[model samples]
Structures are given as C-alpha cells and as structure tokens.
Target: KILARVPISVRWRDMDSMGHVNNAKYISYLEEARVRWMLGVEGVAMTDRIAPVVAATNVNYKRPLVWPNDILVELFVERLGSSSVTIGHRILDQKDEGVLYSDGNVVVVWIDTQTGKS
Candidate 1:
C-alpha cells in the first residue's frame, strides 16, 4: 500500500472572517499536502501517470483548526486498480490525540493528460 505522512502548520492567512480556518480551504490544503507528500517526500511524480484527478473526497471537520496549530496528515492507499486508487487521509491534531479532521477513502483517478479523460 502507498502511504504518506505530513506535518503541516496552520498559517494566519489560512483563517477566514469567522476567525477560524475556512471550511472550504481545508480541502485545498489537503490537496497540497497530499501532492507534496507524494512528489516531494515519497518520490512519486505527481502527473497524469501518477495522480491525475480527484475521483472523490469526503471530509469531516470534527473540530475547528486555529492558527499556530500543527497537524499530522496521514495518507495511505486502500486499493489500487487499473485506473484509480482509493487514497485515505486523516488530519490529526498532534496536541489533541484523536482526529480533528479526517477524509476517508479519497479516490484518485488516473487520466490521460493529452486526452483530458480518465
């Protein structure tokens, strides 16, 4: 199974007008974290041949994440197939123990870059 772990610190800019990190931004942050984890750390080239599209994503924000907080994002491949893989992720608050954020079964699909089709 393909697995990855990343530690990401929350920045002040990541917050929204509500004084907490924007709910929508977490998804983007997850994408960035996952990409960096794959290409930068895991040495997997993030491309059409590797990770092409987000087939599916389901995230639950159990608790709000404020600035100056650091989270541990764990990644793993639950299943791999001819055209896609189910990438799992969990955003755990190191300070706390359980999951502050979690995305179960984030499906990623391979698409032909030239054709823009999966």
Candidate 2:
C-alpha cells in the first residue's frame, strides 16, 4: 500500500550550481519520508541497542525540481523480509500530482548494535 506523503520545502541550500535541487537532497527527502513512516506508522524508533540501517538504494531522476516549489515524498512498501524492508518512493509536486521529479527504493536492515549484526 502507498504510505506517507511527506511534504518537503525546497530550500536555497538544497539547490546545486545549476539551480536544480541537488541529487543528494532528493535522497534526504526519501529518508525523511521513511523516518516518518517508521516513527508514526509502525511506532519504530532508533535506539542504542537496535535500529534500522539503510543498506542499499536505487534512485532515478525523472526531472529537475527548481526552487520556489514545495514537493512531497510518497512512500510505499515494496518488499518485506525477515530482517529488512524495501521501501519505494516518488518525489512529486505539492499541488500537481502529475509532476514527478524522482523515484527510488531504499533497503533497510534491522541491526543489533551490541552484537553488530543484522
């Protein structure tokens, strides 16, 4: 099912020299959306003993997002495993659902800090 639609503000700091949102910032948008899902939807929180760690990611840039625009990071469940979950995401325009800026999937693995194992 499609999950959270986290709103994101395109700040001046998020832009690159070409005047488009930095590619790395797009990853941050997905991370922020995942955090909200983990915290709010699943009541999961990172702690000293245990936490979810990103193990992999694949992002595709569909279009560039200019400044002075707000975006939404839409998250959805892609795959679920015994020790991990893969989340899919799309960055969209705040008011125009038709505008897609990027899409990606993130892989998160549960880890035990004390044992240093997944």
Candidate 3:
C-alpha cells in the first residue's frame, strides 16, 4: 500500500540551466516526504533520542521535470529491517499521473543518539 502522497511544487529556482529541474532538487523532495512519513506514523516519531539518517539512495530519471509544474511525490515502504527501512518513491505529474518523471528508493537507518546503535 502507498504510504503517503506528498504534493511538491516545482520552483522556478529549482530549474537548471539546461531548462529542466535540477537533479539535486529531487533529493530534497524525497527527504521531505520520507521525514513526513515517519512523523505521520504513530509510535514511530523520533523520541528517546532516536532519530533517522539516510544510508543509501537509488534514483532513476525516467523523464526530465520542468519548472512551473505541480508534482506528486509518492512514498512507500519497500523493506523494513531491524534498524533500517527502504522507502520507494515516484515523482509524477499532478495533472497527469501517467507522466512519471522519476522513481527512486531511499534507505534510512534509525540509530540511538547516545550509543550510535539501533
């Protein structure tokens, strides 16, 4: 099942000189959605000095995203390990969901703030 449908706007400054959205901007979108997903879930909120840190990411640019567009960032769980979770995401056009701009996965690890262990 889908975890969250985050609405993200393509800002004008996010555009690269190549006339498309900068690739690095997508990382921020993924991060926002991922963090919000954690915050939205019950019993999963960061507490007791436990927090998250990204371990890995794999993104494939299927199509170039342009500015002045509204996109939907879809986030879902791909894997749940003992201390890490793999969250998959899809960036699609808000007006036309069939238009997929990018897809990726982010591996986030939960660690103890005191001992650096989960």
C-alpha lDDT (0 to 100) for residue 1 of candidate 3: 59
Higher-TM-score candidate of 1 and 3: 3
lDDT of 3: 0.84
Q: What would the per-residue lDDT of candidate 3 be over residues 1-118, giving only the tens digit for each residue?
A: 5889998887999999999999899898888777676677576665655677788888889998887888999998898787887889999999999999999799878774532443
Model 3 misplaced stretches (Cα beyond 4 Å): 39-48, 112-118
lDDT, candidate 2, 67-102, per-residue tens: 888998999889978788788888999989899999
In model 2, which regions exceed 4 Å deviation? 41-46, 112-118
Model 1 clash pairs are none
Q: Give each model's clash number.
A: 0, 0, 0
Compare candidates 1 and 2 on TM-score and give the better one.
2
TM-scores vs. true structure, each candidate? 0.75, 0.85, 0.85
How would you encode candidate 1's per-residue C-alpha lDDT over 8-66 as one tens digit per residue? 78789989999888877777767877777766755547343544788788777777888
Q: Please report, as a residue range, the 10-residue window in candidate 2 with the lowest summed lDDT.
A: 109-118
Better of 2 and 3 by lDDT: 3
lDDT of 2: 0.83
Q: Rate residue 23 of model 1 by lDDT.
A: 76
- What TM-score should be assigned to candidate 2? 0.85
